[PDB]
Symmetry: D2
Subunit: 481 residues, 4 copies
């Protein structure tokens, strides 16, 4: 009931949700910053009203959190870098060659040493140096760092969310709806690879890209920018994000021969008795479309094979929280509320499973099933880059932690190459549109004083990290809540 | 514990939520029709997915519901007429003189007999004749009818909600954002006044106009068209709706000397201990702004006195369901969740009050306080044009009904000229973006068979209507639930 | 959806739970009276602490309740007579011949005219005359009365509950544990038959005798006298009660040729999938044992045939409230909590059924299944003598009423000779050890003022009684809650 | 935020609830053993149906639990010895001088060396040696042991509970109702003192004696033997238990000069605003009566001063779990349900406090107030001998543990001589009549396999024990849940 020698155990974080908190560390130059400070979004209830500047303040407290992490047995951490802190001003003018196929696809972006030297002139050195400083503080402790380049926020010069909602995508800097975002992201990737390449053991181009376009252009009641309902816009954004990844991959490899992958949000799909295999297609079209393209260069019923997109997934980051259950075959399976992410805060699902403060059903088995299926589908190394639960009372986290770590063990014990488990957040943080009311930390944070408090789950985590597995004395928590 | 001789007792309904249900009676020409059938709105969860064509089918069953109403003691009913059923095609070309002041305000719209004869040529006779037929069926029973001209849906030729959201108000037929809506509404009002003027005992220009612009341009998560977040758009719509009312009033009076008023959505505002009188201003700015203008011709801290808007409120229709509670003075009182409309479905408020299926707190005292305050503010005749509760099990309606009828009695007993009480809906209906899951009927409706079933609250209603008051034997329900 | 012409519709009541309430009407001479006033029982929580003297006061208000009943459409009522009010003093000395078989069974008790004349000398005339007065007040209205002789309380001279618990049955007047109770009950039966024989259309010797011995000697935590845990005592009491019934039957028939039956408490038993038929035996041993003996003169695996007990069930009174669900075959089926009577107050059962204030699952289908099974088992006329629900808010009663009346209709429509439906209580009353916190009335009673208030369910009842069935307009309530 | 150097930290256990579990270790010779195996008690629901033989099996696993305890930082443990395991056969015949005053009180029992040598001949050596073995295993680790002589079960030769209930106390071996129990207990105490005197650092004559007589003779629905409702029997048992303590104290002192005290169940009494001081008397009569007598030799309004009972409380063991709240002065304060021990499982009290699985309100402040009050009343050294919470999910224990440890710190910090804190149970155990459904362990026990699993609260306990206080990093849990 122990993991391999070099198995990575730790947690993940993002720039936007943890950095700000102490005066002077804000990043007012991103779409998300403007979006959550917007009066109309607030009045409408799209955003909670809480501010990132009142966050945990990792930008200033990094050293103390790293010590806390180390005290709990964290040996590996996955972090990101804000595009907008690195390039507050537009990088549009740094030309760079861009190869386009017959259909307008950006099959190649060439960012050479001169371009990088030029980008380095536009970059915000204070931020760049501060990132190296924070991450070097963790790495020089003899610990591993996984660096993710993108975790949602976009620079305002690239995306003006408010203007996109009022005027339409065609009359405003439209973020991922602007194909040039691909080129700019590629330049940003090369620069980071060249500047911080020595720090990480692995790279990740982006975090849950699917959530960005699904929330921003489909599930608009979720409060994600630009909140512009349009399936057409969603597909466009998805398309450019897939390209942005492929191009970022090429450019990172030019300055860093380290593994380059992608962190993705996977819900474990499920349905009726033996309805049909029409579900498999369903899953291929919505759940596995994106990772299929960036690995195989194609997807379901679509001969198209793009070489510039294929073979660009050295490892796969798995963010797992719960499941999604559907009904009916026909040609349209439908979502059943009361299951997975569609439960009530603190409630119980029809399957007798407890639900988080977010109203997400605790379902550890899904992680097990997800991992096996991913490996059979892609055969690539996997890392649980995110797994946790909104639970301010810590009434679920302890069991939730042991349950999912077990599912990971079970998968590894069966040969699945899962290289590590990273818990979502060591500390509470800014839960995007939801604000601070959603607490995922193993460590509670008083956002007024910025003090960190250990929740009992944190103690449980230390036992697991220290034992590099689940000690017999904690085997009972592989069950439920 | 009885009301005056001619006190009106009954219920209210709207075209959109009750008419369709039987094939062939749909009105596919309004913004709301397109809006609730929209794939994206549905996927996003903005609308429930339920369809109005599966409603109660009053358009075909009117006679049966009128008998049911009569069997229950209903002596008065308030109904509406869909602008889009009357004028499916644009009325823009029927010129008509339009007087504009220096600021662009439409202070006068002259629709004479020729214009009316012309409008009558564009009108959909089948619909016009069917309305006269349905309402004549009720009136010729020796009962009273209150006719409301507008209850939300707008003709598509005037408002294309989907296009407004995608392109922006300036690139689409923008409904109330288009000042010409004022002129068109005035023409529509004159035509109805001239065509159906003999039917009603009183007129209402519109139903809860504030909900239309607040939901459509501010509280966009509510699923109201066009769902275009913009405080600027909200004020503009409000402005034109205020003008539309004033102009509709002038044109109705030209063909009908009967009382012309307005039905409005009033929440009973409340706050802390003795925080301040800054609240009064708050109420004048958000709650009483609109009815102040259409009566006094002005509002708080705004000398402006508009004669073309003042003196256009012969009676006030009061739609009451619950309250809203605030906190803090400063300069920004804030809403306290867990109170009034912000409670949980079936829950209990911090004040031990039961909450409806809609999550709205039962608070009968508010109606009492609201009526007194309205009379002292406006001194005009009042009619509770709406009062009911979302409650499919009828676990609250019986007490909810007696409670509020009591508050009205209490007010009348103290001299307040409340001329009647109309319960919201005799039967369940299509609750807009919420679909059919919200049941307000005294009578349950199986939307599959269209059959009407009496809920016990219906029996209680009959006792009240028959006794024209609250019999001693039912006095215990003036309490709570 | 209507019952036969002469179908009986009304309600039932008992002496102890409704009579007292107005000073001077108490009956301090029964075991139950002393039992609920006992300091130790109260401190222990065996009894609630509420007093019968604070009840509805039917003894004084009978005329007003009869009018209320009549106003609601009640055409038939089932009432009882307190043994202890009729014979406050011991009747032991009125000799009377008693025939005993070889095993000590009391196969015959001869109470002739002289004995009756003698008993009439010991009887409390004021009470006897007052009963005739109350019941004559109902009957002379042209309504039916069903008279039940025993509804739990026993005279103190026959049963001293407190002394039985402290000293043991062998050192105290032990109620039904004293076989002489059979002889005394027989004398009491003849006297009532001779004295009040003209009033009722049918007789009932006793009400739910099984509850008396099961609660009093087995389920002692229920607070029933004498609360003396002993399976041996339970069987003895059951044995003498069976004899008491047979003997009472013989003696009533001597002075009244009217139908004589028994009212019984039937739970609808249920179990697993297809476990076995070992359940049938189970049911025969616990549920149908008693009514089997008083009708067939024998029971399961027990050749014994007693002629003095058989053929003494002209009709069967059915008291139905909920079900009981079991698990496992083996030789011992076990009760599953969370079902039927073992639910939580106001909760929901694993089958999505609402639960009463008593924590009893609403399950109308059980009544249907129970009636068919009873008829096939006994082939005797049946009358639902009790059916209702503890629900002070009247959140279940309306639907509960229509549901069960429907099950009865369904049974009658299929040929089952169910002669009537009597709702448990028109008004709230003293719910034995539970006190007043359990409200079963269709009419709420303020026990402080003694005023009766109609609950909406009462209105629903009137519709059913008046229509002598379930009108179409109320068909939706044949469902659930 | 640390306790003194030699502050005792650990947990308590009892023989009956932990010893059995592995075949062959049962103690079938006590009243509790027979009582929980009784068919009638089970059918009646007086006992759960669970069996002690399926318990944790400490009798065989002691060494493993001691290691677990030590691993968690436990430095002190309080245990008991079953009277019935030591003397399975009657000790009645070992004469021994008994001094009786004028009123029959047993003021003195002389057990000399010969008597002890004789008792040692009747004692069950296997049990005696096994106890010394188990406790020596803990003590020889350099840890402290507190030995309690009585924790409820009585030998069958002294108490036949079933026979007491059926026949009455006067026709059966009536346990504490038999004054000779005083003499036998005194003999048992001298023997244990002489045989195991070297092991403990302190003695306790009995555990929560008040619960024994209150549950057994008053709150009979609780399922405690003999379940014989009688206030007269309760006072008698209380009287003899008070004497048994005094006599046990005298005889322990003869063979052991170590501190001899008593462990008691204290609820924290509370009431209205400023009702009166009639409450103080109330508390003295029910809560502090017993400990008053064994210390002062008298109680409220009762001049009587008994020298043979006074000065026999060297230290006081405090068992605290929750409070009890009353209302009204008059002459009879009454208990308010919904507070303290009268809450619902998992619910919340009217004061916003979480409630345990037992339905007991978490109220840490009570322990603080209780300790101060006890010290001011008695001025004796205090030890929290019991404190814990029924919580199988460990959703409350972590905070419950830190809260109460804080209350103790607060008391010690203010000078109150509280010498230690013992948590109720390291592991889950047999919760008497409630069976295994009530889990109080810091460590979960799978009673099927007998395996011990650490609950997160156990980890929190270790931090406290190791730090000999509440570390800053855990200060947030001194609040609520």
């Amino acid at each position: 009931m122990k993991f391999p020698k070099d198995f990575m155990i730790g947690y993940s974080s993002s720039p936007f949700q943890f950095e700000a908190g102490i005066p002077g560390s804000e990043d007012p130059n991103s779409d998300w910053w403007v979006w959550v400070h917007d009066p109309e979004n607030t009045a409408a209830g799209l955003v909670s009203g809480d501010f990132p500047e009142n966050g945990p303040g990792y930008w200033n407290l990094n050293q103390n959190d790293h010590d806390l992490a180390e005290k709990l047995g964290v040996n590996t951490i996955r972090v990101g870098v804000e595009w907008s802190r690195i390039f507050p001003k537009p990088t549009f003018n740094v030309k760079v060659p861009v190869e386009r196929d017959e259909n307008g696809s950006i099959v190649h972006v060439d960012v050479d040493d001169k371009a990088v030297e030029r980008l380095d002139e536009l970059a915000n050195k204070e931020a760049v140096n501060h990132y190296v400083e924070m991450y070097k503080d963790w790495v020089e402790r003899g610990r591993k760092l996984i660096l993710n380049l993108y975790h949602w926020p976009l620079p305002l010069w690239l995306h003006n969310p408010i203007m996109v909602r009022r005027m339409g995508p065609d009359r405003a800097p439209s973020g991922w709806l602007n194909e040039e975002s691909v080129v700019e992201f590629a330049k940003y990737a090369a620069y980071i690879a060249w500047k911080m390449g020595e720090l990480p053991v692995m790279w990740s181009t982006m975090n849950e890209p699917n959530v960005v376009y699904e929330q921003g252009y489909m599930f608009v009641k979720g409060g994600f920018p630009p909140g512009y309902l349009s399936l057409e816009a969603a597909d466009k954004a998805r398309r450019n994000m897939i390209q942005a990844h492929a191009r970022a991959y090429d450019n990172i490899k030019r300055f860093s021969k380290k593994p380059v992958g992608l962190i993705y949000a996977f819900q474990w799909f499920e349905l009726l008795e033996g309805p049909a295999e029409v579900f498999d297609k369903f899953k291929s079209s919505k759940l596995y479309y994106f990772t299929d393209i960036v690995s195989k260069g194609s997807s379901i019923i679509n001969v198209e094979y793009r070489r510039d997109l294929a073979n660009r997934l050295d490892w796969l980051g798995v963010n797992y929280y719960s499941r999604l259950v559907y009904k009916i075959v026909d040609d349209k399976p439908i979502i059943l509320h009361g299951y997975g992410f569609l439960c009530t805060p603190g409630g119980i699902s029809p399957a007798e499973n407890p639900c988080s403060d977010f109203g997400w059903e605790v379902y550890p088995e899904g992680l097990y099933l997800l991992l096996k299926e991913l490996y059979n589908r892609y055969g690539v190394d996997l890392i649980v880059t995110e797994n946790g639960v909104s639970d301010s009372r810590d009434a679920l986290r302890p069991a939730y932690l042991v349950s999912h770590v077990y599912s990971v063990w079970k998968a590894a014990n069966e040969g699945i190459p899962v290289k590590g488990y990273l818990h979502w957040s060591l500390t509470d943080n800014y839960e995007w549109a939801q604000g601070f009311r959603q607490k995922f930390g193993l460590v509670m944070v008083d956002f007024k004083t910025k003090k960190r408090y250990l929740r009992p789950s944190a103690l449980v985590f230390r036992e697991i990290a220290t034992h590099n597995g689940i000690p017999d004395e904690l085997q009972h928590l592989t069950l439920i809540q």
